[PDB]
Design an enzyme around this catalytic site. Structure first.
Site, PDB file in Angstrom:
ATOM      1  N   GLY A 161       0.824  -1.216   0.000  1.00 41.89           N
ATOM      2  CA  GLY A 161       0.000   0.000   0.000  1.00 41.89           C
ATOM      3  C   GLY A 161       0.854   1.260   0.000  1.00 41.89           C
ATOM      4  O   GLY A 161       2.078   1.292   0.160  1.00 41.89           O
ATOM      5  N   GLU A 162       0.080   2.362  -0.111  1.00 47.93           N
ATOM      6  CA  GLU A 162       0.786   3.664  -0.108  1.00 47.93           C
ATOM      7  C   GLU A 162      -0.264   4.738   0.176  1.00 47.93           C
ATOM      8  O   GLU A 162      -1.336   4.646  -0.424  1.00 47.93           O
ATOM      9  CB  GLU A 162       1.503   3.956  -1.419  1.00 47.93           C
ATOM     10  CG  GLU A 162       2.220   5.296  -1.404  1.00 47.93           C
ATOM     11  CD  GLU A 162       3.240   5.505  -2.482  1.00 47.93           C
ATOM     12  OE1 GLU A 162       3.206   4.831  -3.534  1.00 47.93           O
ATOM     13  OE2 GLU A 162       4.128   6.369  -2.300  1.00 47.93           O
ATOM     14  N   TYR A 187       1.241   9.717   3.438  1.00 51.96           N
ATOM     15  CA  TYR A 187       2.423   9.864   4.261  1.00 51.96           C
ATOM     16  C   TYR A 187       3.592   8.937   3.966  1.00 51.96           C
ATOM     17  O   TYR A 187       4.642   9.172   4.582  1.00 51.96           O
ATOM     18  CB  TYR A 187       2.119   9.632   5.766  1.00 51.96           C
ATOM     19  CG  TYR A 187       1.046  10.610   6.195  1.00 51.96           C
ATOM     20  CD1 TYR A 187      -0.299  10.276   5.978  1.00 51.96           C
ATOM     21  CD2 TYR A 187       1.377  11.818   6.748  1.00 51.96           C
ATOM     22  CE1 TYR A 187      -1.282  11.167   6.347  1.00 51.96           C
ATOM     23  CE2 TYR A 187       0.377  12.714   7.133  1.00 51.96           C
ATOM     24  CZ  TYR A 187      -0.943  12.360   6.940  1.00 51.96           C
ATOM     25  OH  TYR A 187      -1.938  13.280   7.294  1.00 51.96           O
ATOM     26  N   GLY A 188       3.350   7.926   3.154  1.00 53.15           N
ATOM     27  CA  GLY A 188       4.500   7.042   2.866  1.00 53.15           C
ATOM     28  C   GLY A 188       3.911   5.670   2.535  1.00 53.15           C
ATOM     29  O   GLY A 188       2.676   5.494   2.553  1.00 53.15           O
ATOM     30  N   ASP A 218     -13.450   6.346   6.133  1.00 54.11           N
ATOM     31  CA  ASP A 218     -13.328   5.612   4.862  1.00 54.11           C
ATOM     32  C   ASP A 218     -13.540   4.126   5.140  1.00 54.11           C
ATOM     33  O   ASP A 218     -12.793   3.276   4.716  1.00 54.11           O
ATOM     34  CB  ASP A 218     -11.942   5.874   4.227  1.00 54.11           C
ATOM     35  CG  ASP A 218     -11.893   5.328   2.801  1.00 54.11           C
ATOM     36  OD1 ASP A 218     -12.926   5.128   2.141  1.00 54.11           O
ATOM     37  OD2 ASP A 218     -10.803   5.057   2.308  1.00 54.11           O
TER      38      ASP A 218
END
Ligand SMILES: [Ca+2]
EC number: 2.7.11.22
Lengths: 305, 160
Positions: free
Chosen positions: A16-17, A20-21, A141
């Site tokens: 994932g991404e 923030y990073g 979400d």
């Protein structure tokens, strides 16, 4: 920085991404080789040499973790790996569960999830959510991919608590955003609070019976139209003031009987379902009131055999 | 290297449609290495048997281990997903593989409490084997106070 996280955690896969990073699946070499999720979070530093509000959100996650609620993922550690005048790099180490609700729903046999298990899983989901809302954290979400499901059927909420910030369209990677679980006040770009998550619970509740998402729109306006086709056009007094989209732009449509879309749900479930899928956020039930609903009455928690 | 990154990323997300696309539409080798040195079957979402199955039907090596000796059957047993463990052992995974603590998959399953996995593994596992703390499967179960697990194990050991 201040800690050597690379000596305790071995990355194994990129999963994932976010803004923030990146996020890695990794092995925790001090604790058996169990999998954890490593989230890199770069924390902006300001003129005054202090970490900006991202550090305060991480503080909120550490606060939440001292309660150890059973229905949220554990935060095992916060490592600061690098500190310069412009940024701090943190690695957040979360418990990782190797199944999401998307996969559980996809693999279960005909004719679908047993009635009692749907009830137990919605009770755990709402308990987790009430824990967050009672500490003023909105998820925002919630969807089947960040509801994790252990092999014994325990529900854990994941992927919450960091502010929404700009990021270079996701670093330019990963580009299709799902609106299927978003609440009407968010699609209208109105002001939002905790009720946004009960709308999403309502959609997921339906999906546990259907094994297919209830409202599959492809844009903000299409998503709204698919919503209103089912629950009916709200009264003028339920349509928020000062939004760009007028009630007028949509069909006049009455509510449909919900059993056209959700088969197998009992009459107590239907009532709770409709109370989560209430258009006006001020009338929607709360997570704590949902836990009291009669639907959860016979919660048959581990008998004999 | 980038296809091993894509394939293992998809497997670890449980994206079975992207795993299938890469394997059948692009015909990618199921043992391609990612940039951390692992295959997709090592890092896969272990509660998605559909991922394991696609990968193993296309040729993935079921007996891969990392540095320490952890193999896919250890992880399926630790996480408790019996459905994926059965796919692995149907395709030839060794249930008596040892990790670096000298544990069998059944030691890990006992430590986490997963009793349907311990019943499945009991009759094929070496129940005399001691891990690096000197514990057979039964001794470990007893040390945890796991009476249900003890009864399962002892029934397979009391041949007489
Ligand atoms: Ca803790």
């Amino acid at each position: 920085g201040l800690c050597r996280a690379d000596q305790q955690y071995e990355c194994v896969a990129e999963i994932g991404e976010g803004a923030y990073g990146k996020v890695f699946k990794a092995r925790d070499l001090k604790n058996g080789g169990r999998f954890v999720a490593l989230k890199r979070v770069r924390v902006q530093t300001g003129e005054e040499g202090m970490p900006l509000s991202t550090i305060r959100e991480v503080a909120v996650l550490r606060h939440l973790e001292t309660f150890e609620h059973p229905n949220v993922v554990r935060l095992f550690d916060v490592c600061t790996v690098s500190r310069t005048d412009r940024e701090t790099k943190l690695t957040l180490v979360f418990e990782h569960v190797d199944q999401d609700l998307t996969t559980y729903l996809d693999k279960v046999p005909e004719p679908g999830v047993p009635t009692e298990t749907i009830k137990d899983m919605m009770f755990q989901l709402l308990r987790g959510l009430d824990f967050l809302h009672s500490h003023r954290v909105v998820h925002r979400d919630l969807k089947p991919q960040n509801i994790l499901v252990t092999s014994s059927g325990q529900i854990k909420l994941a992927d919450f608590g960091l502010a929404r910030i700009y990021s270079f369209q996701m670093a330019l990677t990963s580009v299709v955003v799902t609106l299927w679980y978003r609440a009407p006040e968010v699609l209208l770009q109105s002001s939002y609070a905790t009720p946004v998550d009960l709308w999403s619970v309502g959609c997921i509740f339906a999906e546990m019976f259907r094994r297919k998402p209830l409202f599959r729109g492809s844009s903000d306006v299409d998503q709204l139209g698919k919503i209103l086709d089912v629950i009916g056009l709200p009264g003028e007094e339920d349509w928020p003031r000062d939004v760009a989209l007028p009630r007028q732009a949509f069909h006049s449509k009455s509510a449909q009987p919900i059993e056209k879309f959700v088969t197998d749900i009992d009459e107590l479930g239907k009532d709770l379902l409709l109370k989560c899928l209430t258009f006006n956020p001020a009338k929607r039930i709360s997570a704590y009131s949902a836990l009291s609903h009669p639907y959860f009455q016979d919660l048959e928690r581990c008998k004999e055999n | 290297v980038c296809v091993g990154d894509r394939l293992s990323g998809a497997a670890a997300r449980g994206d079975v449609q992207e795993v299938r696309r890469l394997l059948h539409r692009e015909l990618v080798h199921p043992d391609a290495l990612n940039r951390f040195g692992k295959t997709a079957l090592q890092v896969m979402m272990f509660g998605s048997p559909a991922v394991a199955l696609e990968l193993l039907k296309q040729g993935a090596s079921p007996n891969v281990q990392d540095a320490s000796g952890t193999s896919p059957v250890h992880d399926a047993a630790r996480t408790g997903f019996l459905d994926t463990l059965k796919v692995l052992v149907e395709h030839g995974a060794d249930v008596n593989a040892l990790d670096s603590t000298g544990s069998l998959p059944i030691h890990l399953a006992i430590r986490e409490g997963h009793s349907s996995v311990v019943s499945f593994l009991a009759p094929e596992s070496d129940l005399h084997h001691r891990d690096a703390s000197g514990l057979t499967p039964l001794e470990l179960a007893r040390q945890r106070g796991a009476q249900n697990l003890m009864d399962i194990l002892q029934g397979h050991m009391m041949i007489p």
